[PDB]
Design a protein around this ligand. Structure first.
Ligand SMILES: NC(N)=NC1=[SH]CC(CSCC/C(N)=N/S(N)(=O)=O)=N1
Lengths: 199, 183, 268, 117
């Protein structure tokens, strides 16, 4: 057992609480994990010296100085009697000032309704950090089990995220109700922000 | 030292597939070969090593070795879909492994995608997200390559949306399906 | 009742001796792999045990079962001379094979130069010439049963059997001591070949000595304490035990060495 | 026959570990090798029945090998241990089963050593 860490370049430590010595791996998005530390304290050949591992019983990985390259997920791998098990893994990321989401609600297009499917999209743009909550209220009634959320990776230029939440309703159900809205709560926002349209 | 994997492909529930690993540049006798699975959008998971053991996938899975190690999967399920990795370690890692020792897997490959889906090609439907700076975008549903700007990661339904804050051209290579956004 | 069983046993012995010796000759001659300079002595030994069975053994059988001699003195002298010559022509081939093995083991890398094929031909020719000359110059010129006396009988036991035996024992003791001391002899395959062939020769020699030791002990004793000192059953059990070695040798050759077994399997 | 290896433990830098290999017709040679996670097997020392010894360049001046003929036990004494010496040190023995038998080789299971504390 080890979730998310925000740190700027040049800032110094991950922890994977368990007694087989752990090994630490590194993997960037969509690539092959590399080895970093083995036997709980030994640096792999050809690896930058910044990474170091310290053994009480709570093992800790540490990075002395962050670099632009050093931004990825880290994994601990503890042996056992006869089967090994990888840690849940943590993920460093670039610190950046707080920002507030810009909310846009999109009415279902006429053609999509013509097919028979209604989708309502709530778009949050350029909001930092990742944590946010989106709630769907239809006719002043909260809905559950009918929405999906997708989050982008950090932007290269401004290190900001975008979230799209999509509500899927049957065309008949869409016709039944009149008021559709999405409520967004964020750290920056003083109060919940609601955008509403009318069928 | 080079490790390669093959045998990853589309499968259906209850199916069986066998994956082989290529070993080159080293003496096979002194090493153990491990198979590691990373489910899409999830953490690393260990399946087995090839002296054989299995994760508590026990029974359903079989492992064997010939300089090639083979993993056989039976009664496949939806959860099995993932990217599979082949790694190299010490021969007696279990005997060697101790409170002070853990060798680790020094060399890794590139991974192979095993997709278990009971489905066939279906046509993507692209719809204009009319602007009700005013953002606008196109939606892709029930299908991907989208060209014109933020494109969201694809989602798996029981779809991806592209928003620009203009012509959106959506190309699905498997089905050869090719599809102006204004107020 | 007993006569039928003994005659069947003697017929079986003659049959095994003849068949085994022809098998060894055919396998060694026919197969190219088994043609080597060490196997020249083995083929000579095969001929020297083939003749004993083809000629000497049937008359000895007749004489033993019937208990009378009828062919006559003229033949009888030929039969005893022939019998004596074949023994002298087997205790010299064993000496030469043991000299071959001592030369190979003790002095490796010089075995090809020293043991030239012409030398092997000279050794075989000399061995047969000495055997025949001694047999017929100690049979025609004097000095059916071999006639023991004061100096001829006593001298033959000591000079023919006992003297070669001690040289062969010294050669084998030294060869075993060096074999144990050394680690690598000559490629790994070459070392294993030398060791296996040395085992083959040592077992054939030990079998020969164990088979023929009782007869020669009796032969010395009859000179020492009188011709009739020992019983008839003891006198005639040893002779047949000695004669059995000729039948026994082919089995040893096949069992000890893989190449003989393969050649025999191919032949039949 | 089984080669039993021992003397493997976690050692602080600069420490010393004396290893011991026990073999249960004749034993001709015994060798030591080290295999690291990203490196190939490397010879460190070898000793004959006579007692002649040869050493690798890195090992030289710190490692010594000696043979006990009576009990068929060899040992390696490592001094000036440094993090580069982290490896699984494997024992190796050459032997003959019988007088007429061919020479054969034997491999140990490995004793893991970590120069850290
Ligand atoms: N080589 C040589 N110089 N002498 C001898 S003496 C006996 C011998 C073995 S063949 C004689 C076997 C035989 N007829 N025995 S017996 N009791 O007379 O009927 N070689």
């Amino acid at each position: 057992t080890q979730s998310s860490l925000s740190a700027s370049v040049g800032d110094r430590t991950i922890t994977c609480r368990a007694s087989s010595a752990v090994a630490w791996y590194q993997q960037k998005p969509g690539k092959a994990p590399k080895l970093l530390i083995y036997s709980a304290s030994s640096l792999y050949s050809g690896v930058p010296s910044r990474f170091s591992g310290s053994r009480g019983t709570d093992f800790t990985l540490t990075i002395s100085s962050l670099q632009p390259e050093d931004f990825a997920t880290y994994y601990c791998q503890q042996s056992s009697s006869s089967l090994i098990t990888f840690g849940q893994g943590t993920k460093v990321e670039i610190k950046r000032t707080v920002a507030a989401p810009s909310v846009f609600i999109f009415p279902p297009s006429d053609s999509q309704l013509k097919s028979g499917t209604a989708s309502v999209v709530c778009l949050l743009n350029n909001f930092y950090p990742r944590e946010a909550k989106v709630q769907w209220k239809v006719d002043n009634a909260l809905q559950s089990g009918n929405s999906q959320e997708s989050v982008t990776e950090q932007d290269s230029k401004d290190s900001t995220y975008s979230l799209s939440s999509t509500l899927t309703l049957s065309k008949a159900d869409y016709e039944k109700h009149k008021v559709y809205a999405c409520e967004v709560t964020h750290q920056g926002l003083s109060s919940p922000v609601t955008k509403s349209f009318n069928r | 030292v080079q490790l390669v994997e093959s045998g990853g492909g589309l499968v259906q529930p209850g199916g069986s597939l066998r994956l082989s690993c290529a070993a080159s540049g080293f003496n096979f006798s002194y090493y153990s070969i491990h198979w590691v699975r990373q489910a899409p959008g999830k953490g690393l998971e260990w399946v087995a090593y090839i002296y054989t053991s299995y994760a508590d996938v026990k029974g359903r899975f079989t492992i064997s070795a010939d300089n090639t190690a083979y993993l056989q999967m039976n009664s496949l399920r939806a959860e099995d879909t993932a990217v599979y990795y082949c790694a190299r370690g010490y021969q007696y890692w279990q005997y060697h492994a101790s409170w002070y020792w853990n060798g680790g897997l020094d060399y890794w490959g590139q991974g192979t995608l095993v997709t278990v889906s009971s489905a066939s090609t279906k046509g993507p439907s692209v719809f204009p997200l009319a602007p009700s700076t005013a953002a606008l975008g196109c939606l892709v549903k029930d299908y991907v390559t989208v060209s014109w700007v933020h494109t969201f990661p694809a989602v798996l339904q029981s779809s991806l949306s592209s928003v620009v804050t203009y012509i959106c051209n959506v190309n699905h290579k498997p089905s050869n399906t090719k599809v102006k956004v204004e107020p | 009742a007993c006569k039928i069983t003994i005659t069947v046993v003697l017929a079986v012995l003659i049959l095994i001796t003849v068949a085994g010796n022809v098998v060894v000759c055919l396998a060694v001659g026919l197969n190219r792999r088994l043609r080597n300079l060490t196997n020249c002595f083995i083929v000579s030994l095969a001929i020297t045990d083939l003749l004993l069975g083809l000629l000497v053994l049937p008359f000895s059988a007749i004489y033993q079962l019937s208990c009378k001699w009828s062919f006559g003195k003229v033949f009888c002298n030929i039969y005893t001379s022939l019998d004596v010559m074949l023994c002298t022509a087997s205790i010299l081939n064993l000496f030469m094979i043991s000299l071959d093995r001592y030369c190979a083991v003790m002095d490796p890398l010089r075995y090809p130069v020293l043991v030239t094929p012409v030398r092997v031909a000279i050794s075989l020719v000399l061995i047969w010439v000495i055997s025949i000359t001694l047999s017929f110059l100690s049979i025609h010129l004097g000095w059916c049963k071999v006639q023991v006396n004061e100096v001829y009988g006593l001298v033959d036991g000591l000079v023919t059997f006992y003297l070669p035996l001690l040289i062969m024992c010294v050669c084998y003791t030294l060869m075993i001591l060096r074999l144990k001391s050394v680690r690598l002899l000559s490629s790994r395959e070459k070392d294993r070949n030398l060791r296996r062939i040395t085992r083959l020769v040592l077992v054939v020699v030990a079998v020969f000595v164990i088979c023929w030791f009782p007869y020669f002990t009796a032969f010395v004793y009859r000179g020492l304490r009188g011709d009739d000192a020992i019983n008839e059953v003891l006198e005639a059990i040893v002779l047949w035990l000695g004669y059995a070695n000729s039948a026994l040798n082919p089995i040893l050759y096949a069992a000890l060495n893989r190449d003989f077994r393969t050649g025999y399997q191919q032949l039949f | 026959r089984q080669l039993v290896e021992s003397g493997g433990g976690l050692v602080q830098p600069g420490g010393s570990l004396r290893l011991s290999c026990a073999a249960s017709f004749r034993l001709y040679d015994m060798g030591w090798f080290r295999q690291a996670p990203g490196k190939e097997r490397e010879g460190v020392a070898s000793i004959t029945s006579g007692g002649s010894t040869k050493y690798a360049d890195s090992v030289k001046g710190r490692f010594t090998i000696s043979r006990d003929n009576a009990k068929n036990t060899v040992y390696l004494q490592m001094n000036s241990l440094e993090p580069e010496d982290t490896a699984v040190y494997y024992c190796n023995a050459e032997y003959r089963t019988g007088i007429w038998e061919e020479l054969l080789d034997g491999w140990g299971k490995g004793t893991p050593v970590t120069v850290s504390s």
